[PDB]
Amino acid sequence: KALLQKSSELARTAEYEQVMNFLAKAISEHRSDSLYITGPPGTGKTAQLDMIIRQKFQSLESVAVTSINCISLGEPSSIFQKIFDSFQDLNGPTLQIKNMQHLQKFLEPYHKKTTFVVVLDEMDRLLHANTSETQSVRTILELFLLAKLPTVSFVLIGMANSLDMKDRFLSRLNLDRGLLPQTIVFQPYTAEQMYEIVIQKMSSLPTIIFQPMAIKFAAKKCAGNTGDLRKLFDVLRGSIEIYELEKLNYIAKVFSKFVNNNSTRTRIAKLNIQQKLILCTIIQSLKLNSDATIDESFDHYIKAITKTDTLAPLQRNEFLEICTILETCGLVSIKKTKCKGKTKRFVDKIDVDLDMREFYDEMTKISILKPFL
Amino acid sequence: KSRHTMSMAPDVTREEFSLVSNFFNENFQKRPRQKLFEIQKKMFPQYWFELTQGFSLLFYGVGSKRNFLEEFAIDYLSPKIAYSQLVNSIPCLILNGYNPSCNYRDVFKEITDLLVPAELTRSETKYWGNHVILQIQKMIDFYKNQPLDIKLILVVHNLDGPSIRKNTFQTMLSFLSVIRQIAIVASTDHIYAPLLWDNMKAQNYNFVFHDISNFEPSTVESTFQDVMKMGAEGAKYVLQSLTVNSKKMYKLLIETQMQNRGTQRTGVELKLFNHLCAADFIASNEIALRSMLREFIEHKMANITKMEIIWVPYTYAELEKLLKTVLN
Amino acid sequence: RLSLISGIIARLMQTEIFEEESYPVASLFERINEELPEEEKFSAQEYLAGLKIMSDRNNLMVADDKVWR
């Protein structure tokens, strides 16, 4: 079973049709379509555009077209050298890769007059670059205006994660010009396209993978809050390697495990009884919805445990260590919030995520803490 | 204190807005504009004879000058007065004052090469110790003994611009306009223009004023500025790109918040909201609920106050529009 | 109709009587006839169809028939 479940994890998409429509100008040498892809995170929009360009170059006259990744630049100069990277040559780029006019000068083809179109992968770093109205909106205006005289221009094939980019554009420029209009969206595919990509790559289907209906169950009950079926497939390969370790049963188990310790693994998160005690003490201080300081909750602990004589209370530093433990598992968050008493004062305002009902189970089972509920 | 709030307004898409502004501003008062323009064009030889004495021509009067500015300058003044000198028509240095990216340093770096580089004055380039002002001082000492003819015509659109009006830029342009061989002509929009210049800067400018009112829509100037239309519609595109579970949960939210303009009284309590999103078997607990809620919150797509009211500040009309159009 | 019984299944998912999102079909029977609703539990195929609606609306899933994920 190993060599399968190992190899299990090692055109194609239906989406390929749509962009193909928006690509008709590129396989007939016309000026390409004004393509500004947006996409919610997880859907693979980066890898979506990457499958696009990969197929487009493995399918095709001289065939040259590139797509560069804009991450560590924060400025519109060294980007276009990365397009000069396609020449495999050496020049003085410093200006011809910096200003829009110099860019137009920079893009008259040389070898055979096979049109070269430009693609910017992960513009959502240039889009998410320095201050908007100063450089990033300025860079967008510059790179985005296609006012060349030869219609064989640098037709941007852009990609942006958060839609706000189109809202940050100049209002006048976007409506009547640029790569903007085809603001194609790629909403999270529950099963209907991504699950079928899964099946089509899994044509060489291992014998007992498991119940396909439980597979689709996993697909839905994840994609509810998920955008990675391949990564859900990876937690599935981990499940089958659990089956191996013990030498789709356990997948509901592992979901109840990893997603929310509140279900059962909170008892692990609060393994020590003093942890549970301090947590219920925080819940008690919640009745005073104030700055849940170390001091507030600590004094509340002191009084409530002098009352309920379960144990001699902990030291200040001890309570510190306990709450830090509680924060390491993340069951309760803290933040060094600012109060204005003397100066900018930074004290731990905490917020618990647990509910007294999710305390009902986890406490009523331990009758020793119940003296404090 | 029930005030008319711009929220309760008929919003207009950017396309309809742009297009109707186009129709109006290109057809509203055409015949008046052209009559006014053909009438005032007769003043152009008057401007010729006035600028013969280098009197910096400032232009006021309502309506945009930008169009008319480039019109008078590029087309009439420059080449005619160039021919009149006795050959490249004198480079028209247009200052996009409305553009807030103008800076004295670089524009003077241009100016320098525009002006006479008779000596290697680049040798006088130094540390940040501003050679703009010192070098322009030297340039003035030079021109004090040079012949009198315009060697460059600079024109500023909206001299009250967000950059030029900076007092440093203003003083630089003053000491510049002291030069005789240059013709200074500009315009503003700020009604408080005279607040800009003391008798020192006036002496530098020797401003002569002229009214020009043609009642333009300020096309380019409308571009750089921005108002609230330039939120409900912000979230309207967000919800167009989400997951079906988010669609359904926001559908339930919008029903229970629109049942009772979408006011705060009409919302729902998170207790009963969890009761519902658990009854119809959507939310497993409060943590996942608040998680799939903050995706709306982390873009400010719904309001919450206190009961535990989650109230959509978006209008009843726009809300039921979401229902009938994008949700159902 | 199915709304209220779905709410009852919700408050019975609140407790760990299912111990899971999964639940025996035996628990199914224990929680259709033994509860308040009498004859509101439809014919075999009909309440199975109700459960299939609840599946297609992502409220209850089917797997390992003796239980249901």
Add this chain to the structure above:
Amino acid sequence: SRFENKLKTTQKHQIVETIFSKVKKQLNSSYYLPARENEFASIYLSAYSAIESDSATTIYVAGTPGVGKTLTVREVVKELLSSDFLYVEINGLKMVKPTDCYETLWNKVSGERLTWAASMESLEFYFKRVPKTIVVLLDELDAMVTKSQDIMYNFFNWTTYENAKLIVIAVANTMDLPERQLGNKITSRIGFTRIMFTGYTHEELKNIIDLRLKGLNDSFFYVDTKTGNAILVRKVRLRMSADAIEIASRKVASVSGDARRALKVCKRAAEIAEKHYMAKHGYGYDGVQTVHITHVMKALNETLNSHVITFMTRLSFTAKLFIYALLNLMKKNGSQEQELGDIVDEIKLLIEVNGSNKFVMEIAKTLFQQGSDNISEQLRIISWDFVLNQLLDAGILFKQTMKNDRICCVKLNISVEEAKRAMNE
């Protein structure tokens, strides 16, 4: 490497090794394990799948330090060493700058010294070009991911590639790290495949302790009564009473359950007994031994008790006067915030509320002028600046910064209660 010999010298006159010395030597924090057993195998099979099948994945693990996780992944990649990979301990808390990791990477890939830019350029190049698995230890990731997550954005966008010759073994401190600072888009690439590490039970603590004491538990040495040297002239034996070990394990598992803390407190009690035994015989430094419960009792209590009380019971009388006045002000105004000059006024009060008593006379005199009526009439009490500072820097008192020294605020960092108690002794 080159300088390693430069630390080795010859003059060593047979350093004496006593019993507890050997104990602590094997009890060192450096030298199969019981506590993390199924985790060992789980991560082992994760990396086995990722490498033996020549794929690339992201093994996220989180939990408080001291849970063995650094040792555990090391054990896994050590048994894997015997069966392609570059164990690159990229510790964000070891990186001088945040970006420095790159260079290490940028070195371990080719052995070049350029900037982080070309570093990541060639890195991603290798990750998407090289035709065909190198375990990079992202120790204490937090430091690297603090500025704008761009670092981790890169560090995982690299991983997401399919043919990327890049396995990552990331370890963070808390579980929710990817869901509080990392981008949602980043969080997705991080994935849900993260293994959590719980605390340690006192059972596991006993296990690890006896493990460290395997070859030495209750064992015999050959100790010369003259020099105190031990060899694993009487053949003595030693017992490490597992009841004290029990109680230490219980106490540590209570609040924290950390291997480091437990090991260290055991070492502490050991060396305490060691110094007592040395003193009882005076061997200097050139029948049967045990470790009573009382030793570990002391060594453990010393890891909890503070000193602020036992400190403030020793400050100068001026300091105690200052503190007691401050407490009177705290309860009189109910503000727990006083003004410095106001405290001076209160000290004047407290000195004068008592009568013209000759003893109050002496106090007034000295506290206002060290005798020597020749020089007298001080506005604020003697050493007042000095004692104020001696408090402030000691972290007890906490004061804002205004050059006007009569309206500047003052606050107690310690609890009012413990301070009051200190005044009561």
